[PDB]
């Protein structure tokens, strides 16, 4: 319950924060030297998928 709850909050916030192009959430991708537009797009897809996974896992535990 607790890990599932934490992960839903965190993935939800990472999706929300990725809408703001100057959010600090963009600074975590340290493998990438310069964040390009096509990186931002793929990151947004991955984050949306991670949120939907976290939503399902919380619905199971709740």
């Amino acid at each position: 319950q607790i890990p599932a709850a934490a992960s839903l909050i965190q993935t939800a916030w990472r999706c929300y924060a990725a809408e703001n192009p100057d959010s600090s959430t963009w600074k975590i991708y340290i493998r990438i030297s310069q964040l390009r537009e096509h990186h931002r797009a793929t990151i947004k897809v991955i984050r949306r998928m991670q949120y939907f996974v976290a939503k399902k896992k919380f619905q199971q535990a709740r």
Binding site: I2, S7, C15, S24, Y29, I46, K57
Partner: protein, 143 residues
């Protein structure tokens, strides 16, 4: 519904390396590792299984479109995020301490960075007791 399709098709094509119109765990994992992530096979399978609507283990373009069109801020998600916060609100007063919130956000689950949590808290509007009203967070993320 318009030129969004060309964008989604461009996005889809980034993941589908071999061009067969289908995204596997292996290809999803390739894109994530190139971003410096290190997903397990279990995490890759959960991500596919959430998008894979016909249960054949891979993602075709229509299934990708369905997920890209899914509503993220609807009433059902709002209530689920609110109940996730309520897990850390034992007394049910609608408030979480800023200290408990930062520890949960940084040390459990996905483990946000300190700078990320700083950004969360800055938007949180703390009261004068170190308490965060998390219903404001929920509303802020779903507006």
């Amino acid at each position: 519904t318009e030129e969004q399709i060309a964008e989604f098709k461009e996005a889809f094509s980034l993941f589908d390396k071999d061009g067969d119109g289908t995204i596997t765990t292996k290809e999803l994992g390739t894109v994530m590792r190139s971003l410096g992530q290190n997903p397990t096979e279990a995490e890759l399978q959960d991500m596919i299984n959430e998008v894979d609507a016909d249960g054949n283990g891979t993602i075709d373009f229509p299934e990708f479109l369905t997920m890209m069109a899914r509503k993220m801020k609807d009433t059902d998600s709002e209530e689920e995020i609110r109940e996730a916060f309520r897990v850390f609100d034992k007394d049910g007063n609608g408030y979480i301490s800023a200290a408990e919130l930062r520890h949960v956000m940084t040390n459990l689950g996905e483990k946000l960075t300190d700078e990320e949590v700083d950004e969360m808290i800055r938007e949180a509007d703390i009261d004068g007791h170190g308490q965060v009203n998390y219903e404001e967070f929920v509303q802020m993320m779903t507006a």
